[PDB]
Symmetry: D2
Subunit: 191 residues, 4 copies
């Protein structure tokens, strides 16, 4: 079966192809079908926005469509930057400017109120109109100064819960996560 | 390695073991000293799964998975939420919970009857790392119950993409919905 | 000038008249929903008294061309994600059985510890002008839900609503309460003036 | 009886004092923060002007034992999940830089179609009594965010706030017009049935 991946980034398809083995699915990207207008995204709901993108994919191709939506949710900003994460400073794709704005907005906020999460949502919409959306949230808080060089986006200022290091400072924990992650997808049982 | 499943339901632990088919021993709450389970409020299945998983770690030092599931109805500001099982005031009275929901929505037109079945799962590590995932099956609330192959709100939940209720779906129809839900859960870039 | 009040209760229009006389406004006759042709009233859902008051006022303007004031009141309970909300009066599923609404709420919350029993009585008022201006105001009286009803001088959820600042329910307050009056009588107008939208 | 106005702005007491004369409330003395010992003001987060006004009023009572009125106002934009919220005056990271706050908002909202640019000016006010009774009110003036600034008869976000019912921004409104919007807001606040 052909499934439309509502992305032009082959990195999404490559990971999705290898993850679908864990059975006859052929994945196609937006670069394989005629271009269509992409509705701009607003608000804090990664889930709603992943569903909107996935609905549009089905609408234009008649194929089942998976779409994703990811970003940063900050309690003190009412869970924004939200789906404006990549353009929070007003400038799309400028990671340093997005981070600089966030730090300045939060510059007086004590650590106890700097809670935040990295969020990633994935939606599936079928030709028959079934809708399912999933999301994952990695809990943490916003640092006061950026640290670390092994990360993109907000990694230099996102401190995962459970430590003091930022995500960009990250290189026993692997074996614990690698075995625990499957159970998180298993206890999900919508039917 | 021991992983605590924050549940006293032995069928849940057995099913979770069947998904592990790696040197991992799953332990339940009944295998560890009893502790008081704080009652749940609000609409956030994610927050409540995390609370239960944190509590498991706090009492055992083990990594802990917890789940939290129910029905979220747009017209009730995403309640019944974590009160889904006791919405009528009486825990486990599925028929009364359903009858209450219908009565609360009795004059609401189809366009505003949107709802979702939600299932959230949380992981907390001994070191305090926290991850929560949730799945949402989008649909709407029927006006009358239909079907006999379901529990809870299944007789009045109409999945988007059809007119039949969840309780009217065959077992084959129900597995195809849970296979795609778990397939999305594995795709999450995070 | 005529203003539509989106109500069938003459007492509501009487109070608005008394506020326009104590506000120093003249030449304003209020008309009710029985003074204009009947129109379909869309049922209310959700937790937002403000949004729902605005929906009702827009509809009033739509059918009459008059400025329209509408109101929307009820109970917001933290543990119910701020429901009963605009379903407060029919929380048990049937409008007008206050006793059943109150019993359902208590039963729904029966295991919730005091610290998480927070709630508020909310009252929202919206104005939409013929030109399409929209203003909405709300007031919230903070409190919590009792575990058992008490008091006999109240309707609706009053026997199970505990105002913050005491242990008594709204139904337990004496008419002389409504020393506390003089503090409220001076403070209430100050909340009204400081709502300064036009800046 | 003394009532604390949780403000250091003398204009706030005068406006409230004039309202105690129009009510006819006797024997009430208004006090400002400049008349009581200084205490730490906790920074504000989120979108709830109501919650933040209550936090400020509670703090006043805690430090003085007086009934306390406090206010909190700003801009709520649908597309930013009702932010800038209580960060309205420092939305760009710099308090009081209206040009920077407004330009950032415009930049954040570029390419957002008119139907989704909804917004509101919000003004909330809280009362907390010595006994711990809590009442909070808010008013919302509905509108949307312009694409380019216009008008000079306003500060802050006035040049890019388009009130519902017209195409002009708040900064393009005359003083006669801006007077009538606070009059209707305060008249609605007095009409609120629960205020009974």
């Amino acid at each position: 079966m052909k499934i439309l991946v509502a992305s032009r980034n082959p990195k999404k398809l490559a990971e999705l192809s290898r993850v679908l083995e864990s059975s006859g699915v052929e994945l196609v990207s937006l670069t394989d079908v005629p271009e269509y207008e992409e509705v701009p995204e607003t608000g804090a709901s990664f889930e709603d926005n992943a569903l909107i993108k996935a609905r549009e994919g089905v609408k234009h191709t008649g194929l089942a469509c998976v779409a994703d939506d990811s970003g940063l949710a900050v309690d003190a900003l009412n869970w924004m930057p939200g789906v404006l994460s990549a353009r929070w400073s007003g400038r799309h794709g400028d990671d340093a400017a997005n981070t600089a704005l966030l730090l300045a907005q939060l510059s007086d906020i004590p650590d106890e109120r700097r809670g935040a999460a990295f969020v990633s949502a994935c939606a599936l919409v079928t030709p028959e109109g079934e809708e399912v959306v999933v999301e994952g949230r990695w809990k943490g808080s916003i640092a006061r100064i950026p640290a670390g060089q092994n990360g993109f986006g907000y990694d230099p200022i996102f401190v995962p819960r459970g430590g003091l290091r930022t995500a960009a400072e990250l290189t026993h924990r692997g074996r614990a996560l690698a075995a625990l992650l499957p159970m998180l997808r298993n206890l999900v049982n919508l039917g």
